[PDB]
Amino acid sequence: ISGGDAIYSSTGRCSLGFNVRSGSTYYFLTAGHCTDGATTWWANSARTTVLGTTSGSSFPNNDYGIVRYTNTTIPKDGTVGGQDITSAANATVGMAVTRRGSTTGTHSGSVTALNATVNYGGGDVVYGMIRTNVCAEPGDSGGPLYSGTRAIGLTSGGSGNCSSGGTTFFQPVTEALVAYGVSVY
């Protein structure tokens, strides 16, 4: 399973962000709004292939969560679909980026602003986000935003859609990497 592939919790479907590890323990990152309240994660809608259990969740304020893999045999590729990822980097204005998600597949665009505040309502406000002109639709939450072989962010949300065009905000991945002490591989 790799970045952008579907993941299912008991309440819905999101996308896997990036496979990461600390020592010999493997985890995957995704959006915090997907990890909030979820305990177990599976690879299919039928819930027959277990992936793992939520180990941390930070949403709102930030939007990132991490799942510890408990499935011993599934391949945990350090890629996004087939693209390899080899380091993490901070987004910059004008950067060409690509997002992969389980509903819309792969879509590219550029970073248009940094440190944006996105108010999802009811007190769910997230700060510090990357603004882009890449589209995203339900199901794509938590998928990776990458630039070449660099990991950049995790899909959070936005407006619009891939047919007409949209604006999606992403949680910077370096913040998540540092909060959990993990690294991309």
Binding site: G12, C14, A31, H33, D63, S102, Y120, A136, G139
Partner: protein, 51 residues
Amino acid sequence: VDCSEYPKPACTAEYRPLCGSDNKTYGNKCNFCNAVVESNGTLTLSHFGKC
């Protein structure tokens, strides 16, 4: 589902589908409620889950 606090300028992108009266599957409640607002209250909820 109650779409009173809508519209909302942004929606998270998790998938938990709802079936609108226009026969379209809306991917989550936020996307459904922004479209109810956009239609000026004419779209309604047919049932939960995909259409």
